[PDB]
């Protein structure tokens, strides 16, 4: 008889948080930004095309020096490119071909990748022996791992498919902080600019927020109808945009604890595969499954232009650490740098 | 050129990297991918062990070297995750190898898992990631089926069976028909085999089935199907 009281107490608390959040809402973001000028139609163009991959590209991640980038595809090879001169700085043959995520360390020395093997492998690039050799692999997950993020050079958060993000220690190979609390398979995660608290999205339309220091969940957001599979913080760290499987991105806020705007057109009916921000945050960038990316005005809620030029869907999207250019890696084995 | 002495060696390194990428791409174009998937305790472990003993946590990939051609059979059954999200990894596999056990009718939530394997089979082959692939279907445990059908009955657990109460041939061809007429609505050949615990050569069957798959794709390309 206690489980009935606990479930009804939980639903009462959900109602209390909902109507207390409703009284927290003064207005909407569409109401405030009616006094600012729009950006107008922008025309970003392809500057480089990076034809090195054979299978479909699943994930890319820029370098912190805004020049190199790592790409991962289903042929079983990470390749590290110099995006200025389009040369391939490195080619890393993987142990498992089914790689669904990759990440480049902000110290530059390390790289990591993972996928359907349930293992997160970590390679040491800058080596005295010449080749890119695997430093160590992190094996503590049961489902596939869907995202990797270096926070500094010795610890990495790995979202997985067992409704569990984690936090590892590469010097020992064991995890230190298991972030249990999701109910759907965790699809994406985004680290903060100050890098002390990350956000996570899963297969339950819920974008739960955590801190890396203690280990507790902080807040929990729910404004989506279907599966959310992309997430990205704001440039300061007080907001984050969310891209879900029903052609909707929406911007949640950390202190206001609500959504502020949502992004949808009627002809756009296919889900978002990746989302990212600019350095100023005026433009959201969303890579859909109608093969085109969109630059959304993050204040006036309309789209500031399209990006076409991929024959297949845009499975990964990334903006540099200084905002000079935009990489789109897609299923037609091509990356495209845009500005 | 206006490249440096250091920059030209970077372009030569990039071209050697290109050389190794193409020499690996036209090596991974050679072996044939087979998506094996089978649930409900269908004997997948002894199935793979049988194939590998007659032949010479995470996802597993098994190699095969028959008639100087090479297969990669990807087994994925150690996933506690949603298959709606990682199945687009196999948008062009050559064939889906299903494995259903013959005996798991009248095996029970309250539902018979033969109906659950029917639902899994339908929801896999109705995905849009499997147009150019075929469905190589396996039915395992023949002897357990014939013992269970000389012992028990089938007409009460499946009402649509109108056949002899001690029959095994018409029973297994009825449930093979039941698997076939899920109707992937584009008409396409679904190959089938009746294996057992001690079936020696079913690697020969999957060889002939992927051969007929590739040949059927070529014939429909040349309009002489």
């Amino acid at each position: 008889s206690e489980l009935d009281q606990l479930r009804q107490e939980a639903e009462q608390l959900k109602n209390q948080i909902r109507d207390a959040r409703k009284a927290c809402a003064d207005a909407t973001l569409s109401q405030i930004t009616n006094n600012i000028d729009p950006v107008g139609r922008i025309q970003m163009r392809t500057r480089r095309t990076l034809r090195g991959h054979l299978a479909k590209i699943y994930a890319m991640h820029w370098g912190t020096d805004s020049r190199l980038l790592v790409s991962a595809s289903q042929d079983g090879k990470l390749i590290i490119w110099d995006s200025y001169t389009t040369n391939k700085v490195h080619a890393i043959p993987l142990r498992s071909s089914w790689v669904m995520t990759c990440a480049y360390a902000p110290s530059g020395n390390y790289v990591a990748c993972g996928g359907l093997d349930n293992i997160c492998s970590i390679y040491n690039l800058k080596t005295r022996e010449g080749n890119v050799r695997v430093s160590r692999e992190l094996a503590g997950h049961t489902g596939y791992l869907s995202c990797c993020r270096f926070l500094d050079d010795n610890q990495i958060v790995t979202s997985s498919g067992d409704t569990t993000c984690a936090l590892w220690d590469i010097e020992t190979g064991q995890q230190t902080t298991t972030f249990t609390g999701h109910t759907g398979d965790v699809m994406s995660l985004s680290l903060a600019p100050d890098t002390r608290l990350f956000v996570s999205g899963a297969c339950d339309a819920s974008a739960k927020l955590w801190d890396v220091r203690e280990g507790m969940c902080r807040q929990t957001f729910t404004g989506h109808e279907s599966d959310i599979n992309a997430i990205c913080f704001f440039p300061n760290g007080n907001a984050f945009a969310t891209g879900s499987d029903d052609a909707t991105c929406r911007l949640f806020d950390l202190r206001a604890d609500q959504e502020l705007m949502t992004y949808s057109h009627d002809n756009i009916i296919c889900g978002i595969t990746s989302v990212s921000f600019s350095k100023s945050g005026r433009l959201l960038l969303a890579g859909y499954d109608d093969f085109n990316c969109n630059v959304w005005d993050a204040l006036k809620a309309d789209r500031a232009g399209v990006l076409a030029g991929h024959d297949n869907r845009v499975s990964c999207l990334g903006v540099t650490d200084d905002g000079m250019a935009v990489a789109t890696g897609s299923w037609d084995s091509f990356l495209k740098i845009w500005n | 050129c206006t490249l440096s002495a250091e920059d030209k060696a970077a372009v030569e390194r990039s071209k050697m990297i290109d050389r190794n990428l193409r020499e690996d791409g036209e090596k991974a174009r050679r072996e044939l991918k087979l998506l094996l998937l089978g649930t409900g305790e269908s004997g997948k472990s002894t199935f793979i062990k049988q194939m590998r003993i007659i032949h010479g946590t995470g996802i597993i990939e098994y190699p095969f070297d028959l008639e100087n051609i090479i297969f990669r059979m990807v087994d994925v059954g150690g996933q506690r995750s949603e298959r709606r999200k990682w199945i687009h990894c196999f948008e062009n596999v050559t064939s889906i190898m299903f494995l259903v056990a013959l005996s798991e009718y009248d095996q029970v939530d309250n539902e018979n898992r033969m109906e659950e394997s029917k639902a899994l089979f339908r929801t896999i082959i109705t995905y849009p990631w499997f147009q150019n692939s075929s469905v190589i279907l396996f039915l395992n445990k023949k002897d357990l089926l014939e013992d269970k059908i000389l012992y028990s009955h089938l007409v009460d657990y499946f009402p649509e069976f109108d056949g002899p109460q001690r029959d095994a041939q018409a029973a297994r061809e009825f449930i093979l028909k039941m698997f076939v007429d899920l109707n992937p609505d584009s008409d396409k050949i679904i190959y089938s085999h009746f294996t057992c615990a001690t079936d020696t050569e079913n690697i020969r069957f999957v060889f002939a089935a992927v051969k007929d798959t590739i040949l059927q794709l070529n014939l429909k390309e040349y309009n002489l199907v």
Partner: single-chain antibody
Framework: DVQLVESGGGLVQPGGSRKLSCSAS????????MHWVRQAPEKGLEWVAY????????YYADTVKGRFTISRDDPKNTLFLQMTSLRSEDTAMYYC??????????????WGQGTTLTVSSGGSDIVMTQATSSVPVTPGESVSISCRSS???????????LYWFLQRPGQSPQLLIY???NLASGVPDRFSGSGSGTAFTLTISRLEAEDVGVYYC?????????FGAGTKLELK
């Protein structure tokens, strides 16, 4: 760890021929470009040959452009240099030095021990000069070594292709800094090189008795790769 050992020295007859072989043990040999340099037994060191990764591109110094030949063996993991028309200006100590070129690598990072070929009977390039040959300083003082070029080493991409090498007395040279700003992995962080166009200064702060030796500037803007004359830092 990394090992580069060469054989094929000694004493031979002038005018004849001689082969030379540095075997590499401890790294991925097929991915490294290789160089042969040589040092006159009382003068500084000069560059003689370079072979690329996979033997695609071969460059010779114009002194020995035609009577020298270079080759490698990536499975058997050796690097051969064969020398015909053996003069007495080829009297030197021969060093085998690996070098890899991607974005942000450290060429000339490891140098072999060297053989010695002792025998007896600078046109259309950048010459790297330095007009000081002995700076003896006590430990505990900032020492600035300079080196002058003929043309601006600053290329269009922004890099300045100046390399500094230390040589302790009695062993192989060591790469200190590369592209005149970036320190090698293994050197103490008291060295600091800087400059612009033609001004090129290596500054050592808080010196001790481990930084005593000869200092060589080196250019990489174009071929041939021409060294500097040297600068010795002694004790007191």
């Amino acid at each position: 760890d990394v090992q580069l050992v060469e054989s094929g020295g000694g004493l031979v007859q002038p005018g004849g021929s001689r082969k030379l072989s540095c075997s590499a043990s401890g790294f991925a040999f097929s991915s490294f470009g290789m160089h042969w340099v040589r040092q006159a037994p009382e003068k500084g060191l000069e560059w003689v040959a370079y072979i690329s990764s996979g033997s695609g591109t071969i460059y010779y110094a114009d002194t020995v452009k035609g009577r020298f030949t270079i080759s490698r063996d990536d499975p058997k993991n050796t690097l051969f240099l064969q020398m015909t028309s053996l003069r007495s200006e080829d009297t030197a100590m021969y060093y085998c030095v690996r070098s890899i070129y991607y974005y942000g690598s450290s060429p000339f990072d490891f140098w072999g021990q060297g053989t010695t070929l002792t025998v007896s009977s600078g046109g259309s390039d950048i010459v790297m000069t330095q007009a000081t040959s002995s700076v003896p300083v006590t430990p505990g003082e900032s020492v600035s070594i300079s080196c002058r070029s003929s043309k601006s080493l600053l290329h269009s991409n922004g890099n300045t292709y100046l390399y500094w090498f230390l040589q302790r007395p009695g062993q192989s040279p060591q790469l200190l800094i590369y592209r005149m700003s970036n320190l090698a992995s293994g050197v103490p962080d008291r060295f600091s090189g800087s400059g612009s166009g033609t001004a090129f200064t290596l500054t050592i702060s808080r010196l001790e008795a481990e930084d005593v030796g000869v200092y060589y500037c080196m250019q990489h803007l174009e071929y041939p790769l021409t060294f500097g004359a040297g600068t010795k830092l002694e004790l007191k």
